[PDB]
Amino acid sequence: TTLLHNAKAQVTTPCGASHYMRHITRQAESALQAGLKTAQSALSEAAKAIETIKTETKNFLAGFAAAAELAGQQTIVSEIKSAQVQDVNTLTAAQAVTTPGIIQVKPKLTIASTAACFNDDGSPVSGEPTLKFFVVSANTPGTTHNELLTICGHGSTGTAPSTGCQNDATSIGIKGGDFLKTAAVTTTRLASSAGKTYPAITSTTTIPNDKTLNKAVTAIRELETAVAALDAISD
Amino acid sequence: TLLHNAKAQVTTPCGASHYMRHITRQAESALQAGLKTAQSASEAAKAIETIKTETKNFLAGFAAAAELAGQQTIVSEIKSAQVQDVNTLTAAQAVTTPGIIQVKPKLTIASTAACFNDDGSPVGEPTLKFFVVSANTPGTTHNELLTICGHGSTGTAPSTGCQNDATSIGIKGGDFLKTAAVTTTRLASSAGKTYPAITSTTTIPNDKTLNKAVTAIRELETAVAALDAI
């Protein structure tokens, strides 16, 4: 039998989650090839093999596409989680509100120098199965001086917020920080009255959201049954 | 089998994701037909041999098209990211609790599956179009986006117009990202028909991610064509 899920994989990062999904597609492909080869060697048993492959193609390709789509989503999640507001040094308040010294909210991203989640040479960089995905939402700003994502006060113009903001509005800058908050969501397959099933993911205010994730997991489940039916050909 | 929706006008990231899914739906129909022919009945052996030799290229480009669809789905959601406007406040109270002026991240979260409605329906040489995001550029003087907002009157919304006046201070917000389209059109040359390399080194996704997927999509096109012959 073909093991779609990698037991020796510990998903702890978005890039890890994307490689786990790609592993599903690689394993799904091997099961399809073996079914194709079994029907090819039988050239009746070849008629029922081709029949099983054709009947399961819709379920196979829908879940294959869903695993790939989830790998794509996690790849973008792994890049966007780096989004930050940059610190800006304080400036005497009268000059901080107009040209040439206006204090700016500066977006910044950290862009991979390779294909995201991959090395330059092309290699990856990261019981019932568990599907784990990472999701983003708006970060929560601070609520007092010297906390993230706030206007930074200091008695001395020119001060870097990293050295400590004060309750002092003589000069003002910006203490930056992460624009997003990243969290994991998980669903662990379990035996159901008629087979196996994934509990729903709850994540209503994130990117991706749970409607997007649950739709894809449902299709991954159809890939798993399609692969099991494919393994039954050579068994 | 026509993998490419010729009558598609891709102008949004969600439209780009649906174009990618059209490719996968068309690719499926080519394999299904190829399997239906094989079901009928050495000819049966010929089809199987093809379907098998081309499965590797087929699933590689199929996965790349669906991967790109997943990437464009997130692009369509995060492109909503903004820094919120914050009303001005007397400067001495603006630097500490409880009035501290905050840089407030904000997203717009789809209430459905992104790029789909509740019912589940979607919301020449071919061209592949994708949308990418990059850091937005802040303004350089008062009342321009992504700057501290001065005003003479405390409690003033920045939409009233920021001034060269630091009596009260707030935040003039705006989009956190800029979103632009990248494209590549299949080109006839002595190399056959190939998609030119995209250059985009400062965006999410970047060109190395995109160019790798595009190369695989070209291999899908070649696989669908061989599947059509049988």
UniProtKB/TrEMBL annotation, chain B:
Domain of life from the UniProt record: Eukaryota
UniProt-annotated location(s): Cell membrane
Keywords: Cell membrane, Glycoprotein, GPI-anchor, Lipoprotein, Membrane, Signal
Protein name: Variant surface glycoprotein MITat 1.21
Entry keyword annotation includes Signal: yes
Residues in Trypanosome variant surface glycoprotein A-type N-terminal domain copies: 1-230
Keyword Membrane part of the UniProt annotation: yes
Species this chain originates from: Trypanosoma brucei
GO annotation, cellular component aspect: plasma membrane; side of membrane
Any GO BP: symbiont-mediated evasion of host immune response
Name of the gene: MITat 1.21
Principal location class: membrane
